[PDB]
Write a protein that binds this ligand. Structure first.
Ligand code: CL
Ligand code: CL
Ligand code: CL
Ligand code: K
Ligand code: MG
Ligand code: MG
Ligand code: MG
Ligand code: MG
Ligand code: MG
Ligand code: MG
Ligand code: MG
Ligand code: MG
Ligand code: MG
Ligand code: MG
Ligand code: MG
Ligand code: MG
Ligand code: MG
Ligand code: MG
Ligand code: MG
Ligand code: MG
Ligand code: MG
Ligand code: MG
Ligand code: MG
Ligand code: MG
Ligand code: MG
Ligand code: MG
Ligand code: MG
Ligand code: MG
Ligand code: MG
Ligand code: MG
Ligand code: MG
Ligand code: MG
Ligand code: MG
Ligand code: MG
Ligand code: MG
Ligand code: MG
Ligand code: MG
Ligand code: NA
Ligand code: NA
Ligand code: NA
Ligand code: NA
Ligand code: NA
Ligand code: NA
Ligand code: NA
Ligand code: NA
Ligand code: NA
Ligand code: NA
Ligand code: NA
Ligand code: NA
Ligand code: NA
Ligand code: NA
Ligand code: NA
Ligand code: NA
Ligand code: NA
Ligand code: SR
Ligand code: SR
Ligand code: SR
Ligand code: SR
Ligand code: SR
Ligand code: SR
Ligand code: SR
Ligand code: SR
Ligand code: SR
Ligand code: SR
Ligand code: SR
Ligand code: SR
Ligand code: SR
Ligand code: SR
Ligand code: SR
Ligand code: SR
Ligand code: SR
Ligand code: SR
Ligand code: SR
Ligand code: SR
Ligand code: SR
Ligand code: SR
Ligand code: SR
Ligand code: SR
Ligand code: SR
Ligand code: SR
Ligand code: SR
Ligand code: SR
Ligand code: SR
Ligand code: SR
Ligand code: SR
Ligand code: SR
Ligand code: SR
Ligand code: SR
Ligand code: SR
Ligand code: SR
Ligand code: SR
Ligand code: SR
Ligand code: SR
Ligand code: SR
Ligand code: SR
Ligand code: SR
Ligand code: SR
Ligand code: SR
Ligand code: SR
Ligand code: SR
Ligand code: SR
Lengths: 73, 56, 237
RNA sequence: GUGGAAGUCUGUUAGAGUUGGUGUCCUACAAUACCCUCUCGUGAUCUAUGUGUAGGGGUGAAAGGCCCAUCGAGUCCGGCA
RNA sequence: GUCGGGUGAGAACCCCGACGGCCUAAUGGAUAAGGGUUCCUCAGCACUGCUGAUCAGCUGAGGGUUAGCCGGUCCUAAGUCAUACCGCAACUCGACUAUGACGAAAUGGGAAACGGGUUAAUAUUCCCGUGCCACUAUGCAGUGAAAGUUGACGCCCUGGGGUCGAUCACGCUGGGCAUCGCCCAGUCGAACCGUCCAACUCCGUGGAAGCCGUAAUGGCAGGAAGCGGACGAACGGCGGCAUAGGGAAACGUGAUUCAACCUGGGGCCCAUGAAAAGACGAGCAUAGUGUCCGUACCGAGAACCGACACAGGUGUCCAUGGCGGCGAAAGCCAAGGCCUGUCGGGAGCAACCAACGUUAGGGAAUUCGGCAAGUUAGUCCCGUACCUUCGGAAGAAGGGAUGCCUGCUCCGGAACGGAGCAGGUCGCAGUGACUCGGAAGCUCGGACUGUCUAGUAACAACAUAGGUGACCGCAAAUCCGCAAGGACUCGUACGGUCACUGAAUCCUGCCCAGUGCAGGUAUCUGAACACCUCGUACAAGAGGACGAAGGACCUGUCAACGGCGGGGGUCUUAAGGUAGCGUAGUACCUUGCCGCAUCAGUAGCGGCUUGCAUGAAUGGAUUAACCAGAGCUUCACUGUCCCAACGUUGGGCCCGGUGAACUGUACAUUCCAGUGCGGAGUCUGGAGACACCCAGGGGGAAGCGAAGACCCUAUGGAGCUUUACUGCAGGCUGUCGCUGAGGACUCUCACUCCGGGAGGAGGACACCGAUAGCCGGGCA
RNA sequence: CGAGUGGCUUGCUACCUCGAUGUCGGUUCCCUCCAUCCUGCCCGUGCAGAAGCGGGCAAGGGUGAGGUUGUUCGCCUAUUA
RNA sequence: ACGACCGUAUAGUACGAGAGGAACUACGGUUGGUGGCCACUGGUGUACCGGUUGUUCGAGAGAGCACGUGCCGGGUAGCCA
RNA sequence: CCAACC
């Protein structure tokens, strides 16, 4: 996690980096199916290694609270 | 690093060269403008009244 | 004294210019005669240097290959539509008039056909509220109610890359890299830390502005610094 | 155990720099040099060439620093005896 | 460097040999810029050369640079210019928009050349051998031809293929050494043509419900392994090239580790890592054409820049030569280069100085201060506190081990790789040289890496992430231009402009009276044009009515400038200092008082604290980590000291040669007193004093060097400030023109904006010209 | 209260020096003064002695090491004739 | 070119109720200063002899280099305290 | 003490 930051920057700064990157690298359910093989390819870009589905999402998560809203309305 | 002698060693750039128009080594090969006769800047020849005393 | 940094900026010298020769493309909506008979397929998702957000390359029916301001949830293979009769789905563009009320939109045109001006930044969106035959009411990201011509085109959904702002830069070096992709001079030296000759706040034994910071709107350039025409300051009240 | 992150550590690798000696020099080797010690050395890093910004103007992580040994306003000639 | 010798009229320094040394990322090899003939030969020594000179980068005279395939030339990059258009009083000026051109010689892209021979000096250029590319012609084949591919690309980790080099094993050829049998060198051979293909991707078969696979991640019924197949690599292997070339000769064979080069897998980005010409796609024979420019040499402790043959500065590649060791480290040594970081001779060679070695006992007593010097040191094993943001602190600390020889064990395919065991054994000392941390505690500051005063400041200053406030919906906010126009901006509030504070953590009190900003405003005040009255046959002018912004007045606002006292159990002027911290990097008093520590402590640390004159983003407190930052203490150690000595190298001294500068009113062998514009070698009185020369450390010449940087004076200069004087940009606002029709309104036709266009939005407004009022250190 | 001497402090003056006489403390090295701290020789005593206290001659010699502080001075410690 | 001090004998004496406690003189030593000298002790001693690390000369022998001794041990003369 | 101005 933020252990690469050593004893620098302080709690918060490297506390959020940990979580953000933690929820960032988890196995995500692919939209083009339901597999947990989605990985980030860069800022806001995700791809499912299973079916090769490359798509747009949040900067650190594949879906955002606002993105999940579009669906509804 | 001193601005004097040690900084003089880095000078190996060619800027002013012999001008095709006037023959003076004043044609800036980077600007392609002669600082002596104005070649590359003006068709007219570079001239100024301050190149001599006012009443002469 | 000497011109302040804000004044050096305006001359548009290299130091203050944006790395335009490195920018990818102008994400303006397509121009359709009419009919909406224009559809394309998302051929790829790319990184947009100028916005730190992703953009999508689309191949349209008539052979036109162009980058588009992508909303969240768009992927390769997906089909997008642009026109009056376009379908009401994420990633599709059509005039506000055709958009159902209560639908989040992005890259909204200011004047019909301008290509899009509003809500284009990471994870943002305008909210189409009211319809009409003469005026479409949109709620922009800043919370402002904007009256627009119903003929103003827009894209359904929110902009991709949301949350970008939720993570701290942590290091000066990270700010550094981002700044190198913008038309901005960075880092920032405080006015109070300069010599009197360089800024209204410069000079003095210890650092401190030797004057109130709230400056008048009518102040000339060179003097308009600090808190410009502030209606108020602080957190109190 | 694997893995190999890091404006991460050691390091006269290259390279960059310069804390102290208030050493040597001070009609100098040198109009900013020499030696030892010392700091940085995967990054906001260092570096070559090309290119751009010009004088009340630039450029400045700001020291009134720098803009050809010259800067609290360059240099040249002129105003000017 | 030395001994011999060569040449010469002349030899320490020109040449030969020997012996002795120096340089190893350079003192060697190839080059970029830049220089410009410095290159080669012959003949010279008046000039230049730190002495000499027969020598030379010097002087005289000649000579030398050879290209289809190495650069240029071609392409486009940041960006530049030209023309058109527009602005400007105007232009050699100026932004945009079109078009054209320009813009890369090591080091961006790019059609094609290798090996050897030759010259005093060139050489992938000439010559020999072999090969290749493009275009054009002719002939055969071909109808395909443009879709696609390539040119074409970041950072970090890593697998596989693989050449050179190096090393190991054995053979062959030659050399060296002379108790042994060792040691060294060589053992060669290109472009190109042909051929081979790992990886990746894909296809067939197959049928895994737990197997397949990696250094690691991973893969699969949406089809795993296995089997077969398509496509498909090296500057690589293999064959030719080659009874080519090269070598005195032999003219090897295998292996390991493997730079180059080839090809894959993984990870990172609030960062996304060029473009274009060109090439491929798209066969072959023979022939012809391939012009133009560059080509020497230096590339640096003498060919460049620095006035110099300057200890400075100056890019690239040789990053794989041997031992060593972790190593592109030290040290030693090859290939190669040099004795030119170019004056010599002499004295046991004194004083004194620069570098440096060794010092008994004491051990920081020295000093502002351990400044300087030293101590420690590599690697392995054991062991490691407070505190902490749980990362760290940490190599904490502290303790032990370390060579050689003989024979072995373990890991691994193996190394000329690594980890151990047993026995034997030497020294004062086994990281034996070299390389190579001294350690600990308390406090202050700044969180951290980072920045800076080229040339006296590296810090606590600047930056920073983080916190905060302000402006702005884009025909915007902010900013540049006289204008035409422009930056921000291929940007759009998760934006970016303007400011303040300065990581995290816990917090951030009271004050809106003054000043600033902003909002509102019945009434008051408030300019010009038009309008009305008076005046004038007109005009000047006087007065009136209307009244915009602005001000009065009201309100909001302190993470806005800033403020938080005196008196009494309110007063000025709004409030009257809260949490914290506190004798502070702020406390004058002050060496405050108590304690700690010391023989003794104006220091330091802890506590108290009425704070001359602490205090909350003018941020307060606190704080792990970090630091060439400030202060204090301890252990260790030591010539810092007691108290100095001896030694080493280079100078100093004498000799040959070369050969400056600073300074100079005059006189001048002075000393003690006095006098004098009161600080005299020179005046007065005495004293002393034979001349000259060498060495010395510097008492005096108010020594030399610089028309005092302090201070004052001048109706001197400049930079800076502001509620100084006076003005000028600029912004807001009214009015007039642009400007049209029917104190409130509709319309469309100018004009503006959006749109490719149709058309849409707006609209007599806005923009622009003129003028009036307000603000106006932004500027003079 | 009165009379003086010195020229270490401080003040006063503006005579010398602004085409410069480098500034505190310390250090090192040399000479000197006496208004004597010790040492020699004396006088007095509220001088038994021992020792103090005060005074006279006297400048030959000596007057040291350390803790805080840049400090001078001073405060402090152990030695000392 | 010598200054000063301590100690012993005088003497537990003179003096004094006691407590306490001298001197003349004769001696031994210390300290500061001074001049000289090296038998003794100590330092140095890149004369010299030895041990030994890396590397090179093939090993051996014998040597160079590692800053003007690579490092370590001993140390004659001389010079010194 | 003192090394200028406060
Ligand atoms: Cl940002
Ligand atoms: Cl070339
Ligand atoms: Cl792999
Ligand atoms: K003076
Ligand atoms: Mg766009
Ligand atoms: Mg930039
Ligand atoms: Mg700042
Ligand atoms: Mg400053
Ligand atoms: Mg300043
Ligand atoms: Mg100012
Ligand atoms: Mg450059
Ligand atoms: Mg040659
Ligand atoms: Mg030389
Ligand atoms: Mg000693
Ligand atoms: Mg002392
Ligand atoms: Mg030191
Ligand atoms: Mg094994
Ligand atoms: Mg302090
Ligand atoms: Mg810091
Ligand atoms: Mg400096
Ligand atoms: Mg520093
Ligand atoms: Mg900030
Ligand atoms: Mg911020
Ligand atoms: Mg600050
Ligand atoms: Mg700061
Ligand atoms: Mg204290
Ligand atoms: Mg506050
Ligand atoms: Mg401040
Ligand atoms: Mg003067
Ligand atoms: Mg002054
Ligand atoms: Mg002035
Ligand atoms: Mg337009
Ligand atoms: Mg002014
Ligand atoms: Mg006077
Ligand atoms: Mg003088
Ligand atoms: Mg007397
Ligand atoms: Mg005397
Ligand atoms: Na792990
Ligand atoms: Na230094
Ligand atoms: Na100027
Ligand atoms: Na081949
Ligand atoms: Na090696
Ligand atoms: Na010579
Ligand atoms: Na660092
Ligand atoms: Na107020
Ligand atoms: Na305050
Ligand atoms: Na630092
Ligand atoms: Na010494
Ligand atoms: Na003198
Ligand atoms: Na000035
Ligand atoms: Na007197
Ligand atoms: Na002094
Ligand atoms: Na005396
Ligand atoms: Na003292
Ligand atoms: Sr230099
Ligand atoms: Sr250069
Ligand atoms: Sr021109
Ligand atoms: Sr003219
Ligand atoms: Sr646009
Ligand atoms: Sr457009
Ligand atoms: Sr200020
Ligand atoms: Sr408040
Ligand atoms: Sr680092
Ligand atoms: Sr380092
Ligand atoms: Sr210094
Ligand atoms: Sr030194
Ligand atoms: Sr100097
Ligand atoms: Sr590394
Ligand atoms: Sr300069
Ligand atoms: Sr003049
Ligand atoms: Sr001659
Ligand atoms: Sr020559
Ligand atoms: Sr060109
Ligand atoms: Sr090239
Ligand atoms: Sr790189
Ligand atoms: Sr390999
Ligand atoms: Sr050549
Ligand atoms: Sr060379
Ligand atoms: Sr050099
Ligand atoms: Sr050699
Ligand atoms: Sr010479
Ligand atoms: Sr010795
Ligand atoms: Sr000390
Ligand atoms: Sr001391
Ligand atoms: Sr140890
Ligand atoms: Sr702080
Ligand atoms: Sr610098
Ligand atoms: Sr410095
Ligand atoms: Sr904070
Ligand atoms: Sr107010
Ligand atoms: Sr209080
Ligand atoms: Sr006389
Ligand atoms: Sr002298
Ligand atoms: Sr004078
Ligand atoms: Sr007397
Ligand atoms: Sr006495
Ligand atoms: Sr005092
Ligand atoms: Sr006695
Ligand atoms: Sr008794
Ligand atoms: Sr030696
Ligand atoms: Sr050692």
């Amino acid at each position: 996690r933020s252990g690469r930051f050593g004893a620098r920057y302080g709690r918060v700064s490297r506390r959020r980096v940990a979580e953000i990157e933690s929820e960032m690298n988890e196995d995500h359910a692919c939209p083009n199916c339901g597999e947990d093989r989605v990985d980030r390819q860069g800022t806001g870009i995700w791809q499912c290694s299973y079916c090769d589905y490359k798509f747009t999402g949040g900067s650190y998560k594949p879906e955002t609270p606002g993105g999940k809203t579009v669906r509804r309305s | 690093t001193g601005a004097g002698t040690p900084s003089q060693g880095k000078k190996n750039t060619t800027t002013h060269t012999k001008c095709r128009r006037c023959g003076e080594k004043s044609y800036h090969t980077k600007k392609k403008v002669c600082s002596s006769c104005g070649f590359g800047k003006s068709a007219k020849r570079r001239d100024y009244e301050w190149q001599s005393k006012a009443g002469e | 004294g000497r011109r302040i940094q804000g004044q050096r900026r305006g001359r548009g010298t290299s130091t203050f210019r944006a790395p335009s020769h490195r920018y990818k493309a102008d994400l303006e909506h397509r121009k359709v005669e009419d009919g909406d008979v224009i559809a394309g397929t998302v051929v790829d998702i790319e990184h947009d240097p100028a916005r730190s957000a992703p953009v999508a390359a689309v191949e349209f029916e008539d052979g036109d290959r162009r980058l588009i301001l992508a909303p969240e949830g768009v992927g390769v293979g997906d089909e997008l539509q642009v026109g009056v009769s376009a379908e009401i789905a994420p990633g599709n563009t059509l005039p506000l008039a055709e958009i159902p009320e209560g639908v989040p939109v992005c890259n909204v045109e200011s004047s019909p056909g301008d290509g899009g001006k509003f809500a284009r930044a990471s994870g943002v969106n305008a909210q189409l509220l009211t319809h009409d035959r003469n005026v479409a009411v949109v709620k922009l990201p800043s919370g402002e109610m904007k009256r627009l011509d119903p003929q103003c085109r827009a894209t359904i959904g929110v902009v991709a890359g949301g949350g970008r702002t939720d993570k701290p830069f942590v290091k000066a070096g990270n700010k550094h890299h981002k700044m190198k992709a913008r038309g901005t001079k960075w880092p920032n030296v405080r006015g109070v830390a300069m010599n009197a000759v360089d800024h209204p706040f410069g000079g003095g034994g210890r650092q401190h502005p030797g004057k109130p910071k709230s400056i008048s709107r009518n102040a000339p350039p060179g003097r308009k610094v600090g808190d410009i025409a502030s209606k108020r300051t602080g957190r109190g009240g």
